[PDB]
Amino acid sequence: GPAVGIDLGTTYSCVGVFQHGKVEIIANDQGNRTTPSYVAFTDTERLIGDAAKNQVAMNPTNTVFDAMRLIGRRFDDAVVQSDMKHWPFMVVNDAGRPKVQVEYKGETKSFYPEEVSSMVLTKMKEIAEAYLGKTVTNAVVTVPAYFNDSQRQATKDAGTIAGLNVLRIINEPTAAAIAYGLDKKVGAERNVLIFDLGGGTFDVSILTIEDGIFEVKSTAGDTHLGGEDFDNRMVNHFIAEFKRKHKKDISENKRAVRRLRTACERAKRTLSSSTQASIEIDSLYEGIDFYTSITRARFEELNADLFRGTLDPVEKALRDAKLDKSQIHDIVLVGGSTRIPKIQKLLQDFFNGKELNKSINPDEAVAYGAAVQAAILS
Ligand SMILES: Nc1ncnc2c1ncn2[C@@H]1O[C@H](COP(=O)(O)OP(=O)(O)OP(=O)(O)O)[C@@H](O)[C@H]1O
Ligand SMILES: [Cl-]
Ligand SMILES: [Cl-]
Ligand SMILES: [K+]
Ligand SMILES: [K+]
Ligand SMILES: [K+]
Ligand SMILES: [Mg+2]
């Protein structure tokens, strides 16, 4: 190709390419190494990635996200029915199949989950092409380890629709292990634990690797736990603060809440490197500027229960894998949320000081491994 590795996530997507014995995680037009998994439809255009997310506040009904939560599923699915209740966009039934319904250029249109994902995949393909200066065709696409045949098929289809020849569909935890070279033959089998805390989901996977062959020993987690939940906690904290300081409730102003949310997410990232962060929003509500700050300690307390809760799925995974903590040879951090110091502390303490594999940007690890695997399969 070269062939590329693509990681489609609920909040962000990432693409990498293995060249000259080195994986390059490709930055997009905005210089971002991961692209928001958003698609938007307006009176005049279809927006994808950064352009789409950067307007979600003003176009909630026609800005689609979470397509992978529907991909390969039936409309009658309990999870699909549950999820629909929280989405600002419409999901309709088409002969037992879910389709997202939106308005584009004044007309009603509907798309199968794979079509929405193909739009994001197309963006990742173009990002790779802009970088490589050559057409990208072959690719390795990743999916959560628990995805079934239908979900894998629909994910492959999204790739094909995007003009990609999907060389293989591989598990996200496996891709992460590959990124760290944990697939190399070392004689005996090894037990690896993947701790993936993304934007919308939390996955714990225990793999047993031997002779370059992976076995998913167990999987655990929470499909509704991620960085967005941490943002929500901060948002509520600041809504209350604004109310105290201005006796005005901004909760019903969907846009004001979004500008705050974005400020919070940004502040959250800053808190992973520094112990404090400043939030400055000009004319947040009724021309009132909102300048404030939050400490890492405060951020940790606001999310204490959620953070500590990540250890339960870890224990369950070990239990289902029939292994003790001591039997885990490697712990791999995946997902942007694993950059939070308190999360790393919790996991390391649980593992009695065992070092964590965290040198590869957690939100890029899956794409990294997929790129290596794509090169191998090419
Ligand atoms: N430095 C950081 N500190 C804390 N959180 C961070 C940091 N960088 C990114 N994040 C958070 O990581 C999340 C994105 O992670 P990632 O790109 O792994 O998600 P994803 O693959 O889309 O999620 P999922 O696999 O759950 O669908 C966002 O919630 C983002 O706020
Ligand atoms: Cl871009
Ligand atoms: Cl602690
Ligand atoms: K991702
Ligand atoms: K995840
Ligand atoms: K997941
Ligand atoms: Mg992910």
Swiss-Prot record:
The gene is HSPA8. It is found in: Cytoplasm; Melanosome; Nucleus, Nucleolus; Cell membrane. Coiled coil: none annotated. One of its GO terms (cellular component) is cytoplasm. The chain holds residues 4 to 381 of 650 of the full protein. Residues 1-378 are annotated as: Nucleotide-binding domain (NBD). This is Heat shock cognate 71 kDa protein. The modification N6-succinyllysine is found at K316. Belongs to the heat shock protein 70 family. It comes from the Eukaryota. Component of the chaperone-assisted selective autophagy (CASA) complex consisting of BAG3, HSPA8/HSC70, HSPB8 and STUB1/CHIP. Identified in a IGF2BP1-dependent mRNP granule complex containing untranslated mRNAs. Interacts with PACRG. Interacts with HSPH1/HSP105. Interacts with IRAK1BP1 and BAG1. Interacts with DNAJC7. Interacts with DNAJB12 (via J domain). Interacts with DNAJB14 (via J domain). Interacts (via C-terminus) with the E3 ligase STUB1 forming a 210 kDa complex of one STUB1 and two HSPA8 molecules. The modification N6-acetyllysine is found at K105, K243, K316, K325. It comes from Bos taurus (Bovine). ATP binds at residues 9-12, 68, 199-201, 265-272, 336-339. Residues 183-374 are annotated as: Interaction with BAG1. ADP binds at T11, Y12, G199, E265, K268, S272, G336. One of its GO terms (molecular function) is protein-macromolecule adaptor activity. The modification Phosphoserine is found at S150, S326, S359. Induction: Constitutively synthesized. Its EC number is 3.6.4.10. Ubiquitous. The keyword Lipoprotein does not apply. Acetylated. It catalyses: ATP + H2O = ADP + phosphate + H(+). Molecular chaperone implicated in a wide variety of cellular processes, including protection of the proteome from stress, folding and transport of newly synthesized polypeptides, chaperone-mediated autophagy, activation of proteolysis of misfolded proteins, formation and dissociation of protein complexes, and antigen presentation. Plays a pivotal role in the protein quality control system, ensuring the correct folding of proteins, the re-folding of misfolded proteins and controlling the targeting of proteins for subsequent degradation.
